[PDB]
Structure 1
Amino acid sequence: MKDFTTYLSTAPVVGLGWAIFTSGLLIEINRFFPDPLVFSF
C-alpha cells in the first residue's frame, strides 16, 4: 500500500490523472456547451 502510493507519483500518475482530468473537463464543456466561438459579450 505504501510502496503503491509512492509508485503513484510518476508518469502513470498526474500526466495520466492530469490530462485525463483536463480532457474530460474540456470534452464535457464542449458537450453541454455545444459550439462556442465567442464570449457572451
Structure 2
Amino acid sequence: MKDFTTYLSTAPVVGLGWAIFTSGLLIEINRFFPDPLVFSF
C-alpha cells in the first residue's frame, strides 16, 4: 500500500483530487441552488 500510495501522492493525482473536489462542489451549488447574481442573503 505504501508503494502505491506514494504514487497516489504525486502531483497528477493531486491535479485531479482538488479538481474533482472543487468542480463537484461548484456543480452541486449551481444545481441545488439556482443561478443568482446578488449576495443579498
Please give the range of the TM-score, normalised by the shorter of the 2 chains. Answer: 0.7 to 0.9
Structure of higher RCO (CA pairs closer than 8 Å, 6+ residues apart): 1
Any idea what SS the aligned residue of 2:13 has? coil
State the TM-score, normalized to the length of structure 1.
0.81
How many corresponding residue pairs?
41
Distance 2:19 2:37 in 1: 23
Distance 2:14 2:23 in 1: 13
CA RMSD of aligned residues (A): 1.3
Unpaired runs of 5+ in structure 1?
none
What stretches of structure 1 move > 3 A for 4+ residues in a row? none
Greater per-residue helix proportion? 2
% identical equivalent positions: 100
